[PDB]
Design a protein around this ligand. Structure first.
Ligand SMILES: CC(C)c1nc(COC(N)=O)n(Cc2ccncc2)c1Sc1cc(Cl)cc(Cl)c1
Lengths: 523, 395
């Protein structure tokens, strides 16, 4: 009843020819009985010596099974079905939602006449060659064509009725409206009616909520995540631990409490994938604290296009940021965390800004609009860093919220050398075999100091020199360095780093009143 | 009508590019525009046997409350069979540009090829499959539309230039560059007429090329120099010594001898004043031996200077700029976007090519807001840098 959709094999591929798995009598007879009824319904048809290819058949138990994997390996590619996630919280909450069954509408779609020849299978001598005339079950291109065909049918109806939501998934139709049960019902019948007119008979078993959907549980007034469970093991290999960390990270996206540090330490120096590792006590605790966190399922409400979208961010641990998207106080639509670390050197404002970006993109994808943000950062603060930062940033309209910890600029390097402040010319270098780590300085006032080190690079000694400078000076200092490494690092004005010296220096820089750092080429 | 047969570089296949998410607004606009275009047969919904896809966006050109549909065929263009630039506009005094994308809409597109122009109108939260289409005519933004219309493009330009090679007009994709070194008010008038010279076949502010330059590097002029002042001079001169190796800094560094306070004034010696002056002379002109090379990529770097100030450089060999300039004042983003356009435009003008931009912004940020202030008809290639410009005070 719908225009067949042209189909072809990949560039220069041939159909299947995999010999037929000689089956048994109890088997042959069963299929013989199944093919007969599908035949008398169109779905298939006898073919003869004519056709060359062959897909083996099986009779699962008394159900017909055609192993098409070897014809799906030679069919063109189709426009993917699952374009996008989507998130349960984007769904608009309707008053009534009906679910329609399609089912048998499976064999209810025609296969392109020039492709068919390739769907040839063979039924052994009872003691018979066929081909499909419909989207076979097990054919790479059938889901796509089905959904598409289905889309075409609905397109019209969806037109004459825009206020109705119709989600097509697998063999069902979820239709929601905001009409009254009287009106809703009638519309549905029309739909039932329309659907019939194309050969999609709808049975007049009624699947009820919660609707199990892609790891989600959909209830009328809310959505929940299907329980997330971790494996129970006495012996943990490296493979186990990696997949475990895998699942955890993933699940840490909605369960901000989750930690993986102690479990990932376990991966250190691992010699083999099967190597078994005793769990650390700090690792055992963490694994237990995660099992628990995961006992309370994540859940939220549905979307109300009538109210405004508000997003609230919070500074959790280190580089960790939590966020909630709601319309009414604490009635969360969605919640998450953002913790990426875009580069080695960074600070809190840049991070808060990145988090702000993420939520925007996600909002736009889920609700089609950006939200109003409530951020733990003063206008004064974000504005100073904004016009000082080298990249172009886009801040959205936001409301402050003095809910500690607050995001703040821990410091700002001077822009001009400080008048009257002691000038420190710092320096450092070493021995490549092993350190002659002699870092120290000299000032315009005559003060001088040299410090020897151990187990440290050449740049580490430059950083040391600045640290020594910083620690040994008044509240206002001028530091001249020839290190691009140090300069770069510092000029960025990060407030934290995986380094200890860089960190020490940072707290030093934070303590100071004034600090001008100057670079001069390394002679 | 008969169609011009197009082909993909022998060994290529269509583009399968991801469609960035759009606001409901941009979706709504897009869907209006498309069925109407469908109504007219330009595009017609397509099926799922078409695996290809090209990004599409919705821009609203200002001074009207009308949306325009922009398609990102960048990728398609990179793979359409290799199909086979008038100096003088970069010389003219005032230049103008016009949009001739429409012309193409009246040209059947080669059957076997429409499949590659497939694009998708996205759905909010993916609760709907996504509206699929394909072009039946010559699409805007595709390198193949100009090359195929060429035959009829010049064949419609003669009645203004067969014996009228005084003024100049160049065509870049959907773009029409009309350069005329004539009188200011007497400019609009000579083009407003070409605006009526093509219309006879269907398709119903100025640029100042000659007034550009690969600006010079300038050293400070001062009555008194401080330790720091000199430290900076030496720095900036050092950098500059990779472009110009004749630059010298020995004499100056002599001054940086000892350990004086950063704010202390150091008299310049005669040997030091001479060097600086020779250094000033070397820099008075752009480095020799820097010419455009077609086999190379044109690259453009932008640096935010604060105060709605943005500097940029176009170059092919790093530290061998073909041009430099500045854009000036709104927010970082709007400015950054206007700058890319201004820059791309000059680029098309001077070399008839768009440059690959290195954008000082987070990717996700750009992708979300660039369509907000984009008015061009093309889209340049771009990448995002996360490394501070250490040369923000030198460049
Ligand atoms: C009309 C459709 C679009 C719909 N809208 C809402 C949004 O929910 C409301 N309240 O309308 N719900 C959820 C629902 C669940 C149980 N009862 C009623 C509705 C549904 S049903 C549904 C079912 C599956 Cl398998 C997948 C998806 Cl994405 C949605």
């Amino acid at each position: 009843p719908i225009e067949t959709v042209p189909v072809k094999l990949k560039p220069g591929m041939d159909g299947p020819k995999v010999k037929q798995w000689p089956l048994t009598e109890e088997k042959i007879k069963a299929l013989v009985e199944i093919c007969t009824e599908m035949e008398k319904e169109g779905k298939i048809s006898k073919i003869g010596p004519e056709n060359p290819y062959n897909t083996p058949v099986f009779a699962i138990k008394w159900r017909k099974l055609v192993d098409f994997r070897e014809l799906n390996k030679r069919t063109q590619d189709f426009w993917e079905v699952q374009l996008g996630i989507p998130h349960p919280a984007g769904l608009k909450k309707k008053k009534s939602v009906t679910v329609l069954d399609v089912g048998d509408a499976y064999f209810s779609v025609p296969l392109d006449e020039d492709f068919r020849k390739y769907t040839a299978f063979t039924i052994p001598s009872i003691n018979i060659r066929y081909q499909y005339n419909v989207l076979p079950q097990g054919w790479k291109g059938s889901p796509a064509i089905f959904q598409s065909s289905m889309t075409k049918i609905l397109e019209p109806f969806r037109k004459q009725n825009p206020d109705i939501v119709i989600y097509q998934y697998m063999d069902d139709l979820y239709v929601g409206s905001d009409l009254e049960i009287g009106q809703h019902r009638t519309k549905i019948e029309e739909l039932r009616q329309h659907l019939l007119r194309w050969g999609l008979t709808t049975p007049d078993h009624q699947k009820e909520p919660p609707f199990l959907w892609m790891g989600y549980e959909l209830h009328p007034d809310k959505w929940t995540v299907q329980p997330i469970v971790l494996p129970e093991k006495d012996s943990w290999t490296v493979n186990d631990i990696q997949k475990l960390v895998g699942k955890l990270n993933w699940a840490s996206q909605i369960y901000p409490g989750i930690k993986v540090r102690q479990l990932c330490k376990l991966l250190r120096g691992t010699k083999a994938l099967t190597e078994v590792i005793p769990l650390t006590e700090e690792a055992e605790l963490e694994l237990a604290e995660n099992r628990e966190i995961l006992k309370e399922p994540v859940h939220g409400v549905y979307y109300d296009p009538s109210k405004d979208l508000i997003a609230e961010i919070q500074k959790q641990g280190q580089g960790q940021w939590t966020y909630q998207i709601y319309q009414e106080p604490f009635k969360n639509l969605k919640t998450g965390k953002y913790a990426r670390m875009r580069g080695a050197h960074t600070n809190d404002v840049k991070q808060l800004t990145e988090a702000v970006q993420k939520i925007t993109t996600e909002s736009i994808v889920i609700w089609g609009k950006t939200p109003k943000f409530k951020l733990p950062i003063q206008k004064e603060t974000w504005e100073t860093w904004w016009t000082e930062y080298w990249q172009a940033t886009w801040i959205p309209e936001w409301e402050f919220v003095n809910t500690p910890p607050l995001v703040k600029l821990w410091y700002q390097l001077e822009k001009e050398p400080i008048v009257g402040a002691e000038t420190f010319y710092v320096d450092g270098a070493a021995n490549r075999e092993t350190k002659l780590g002699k870092a120290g300085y000299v000032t315009n006032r005559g003060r001088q100091k040299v410090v020897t080190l151990t187990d440290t690079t050449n740049q580490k000694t430059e950083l040391q020199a600045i640290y020594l400078a910083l620690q040994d000076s008044g509240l206002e200092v001028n530091i001249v360095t020839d290190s691009q490494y140090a300069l770069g690092i510092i000029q960025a004005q990060p407030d934290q780093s995986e380094s200890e010296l860089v960190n020490q220096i940072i707290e030093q820089l934070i303590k100071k009143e004034k600090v001008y750092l100057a670079w001069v080429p390394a002679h | 009508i008969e169609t011009v047969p197009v082909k993909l570089k022998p060994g290529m296949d269509g583009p399968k590019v991801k469609q960035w998410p759009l606001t409901e607004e941009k979706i709504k606009a897009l869907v209006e525009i498309c069925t109407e275009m469908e109504k007219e047969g330009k595009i017609s919904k397509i099926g799922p046997e078409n695996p290809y896809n090209t990004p599409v966006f919705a821009i609203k050109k200002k001074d009207s409350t009308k949306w325009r549909k922009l398609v990102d065929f960048r990728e398609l263009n990179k793979r359409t069979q290799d199909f086979w630039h008038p100096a003088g506009l970069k010389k003219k005094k005032s230049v103008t540009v016009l949009d001739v994308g429409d012309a193409y809409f009246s040209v059947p597109l080669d059957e076997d090829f429409r499949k590659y122009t497939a694009f998708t109108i996205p759905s909010i939260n993916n609760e709907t499959p996504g509206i699929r289409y394909q072009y039946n005519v010559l699409p805007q933004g595709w390198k193949g539309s100009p090359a195929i219309f060429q035959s009829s493009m010049t064949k419609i330009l003669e009645p203004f230039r067969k014996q009228n090679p005084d003024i100049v007009i160049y065509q870049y994709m959907d773009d029409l560059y009309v350069g005329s070194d004539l009188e200011i008010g007497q400019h609009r008038t000579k083009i407003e007429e070409l605006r009526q010279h093509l219309l006879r076949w269907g398709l119903t502010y100025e640029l100042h090329p000659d007034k550009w330059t690969v600006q010079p590097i300038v050293l400070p002029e001062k009555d008194s120099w401080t330790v720091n002042d000199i430290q900076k001079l030496v720095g900036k001169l050092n950098w500059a010594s990779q472009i110009y190796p004749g630059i010298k800094v020995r004499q100056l560094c002599k001054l940086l001898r000892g350990t004086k306070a950063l704010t202390e004034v150091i008299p310049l010696t005669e040997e030091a004043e001479l060097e600086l002056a020779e250094n000033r002379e070397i820099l008075k002109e752009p480095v020799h031996g820097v010419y455009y090379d077609p086999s190379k990529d044109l690259i453009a770097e932008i640096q935010k200077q604060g105060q709605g100030q943005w500097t940029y450089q176009i170059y092919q060999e790093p530290f061998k700029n073909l041009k430099t300039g500045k854009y000036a004042r709104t927010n970082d983003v709007k400015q950054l976007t206007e700058a890319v356009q201004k820059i791309t435009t000059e680029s098309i003008v001077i070399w008839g090519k768009t440059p690959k931009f290195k954008l000082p912004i987070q990717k996700e940020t750009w992708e979300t807001w660039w369509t907000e202030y984009w008015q061009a008809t093309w889209i340049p290639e771009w990448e995002f840098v996360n490394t501070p410009p250490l040369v923000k005070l030198w460049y």
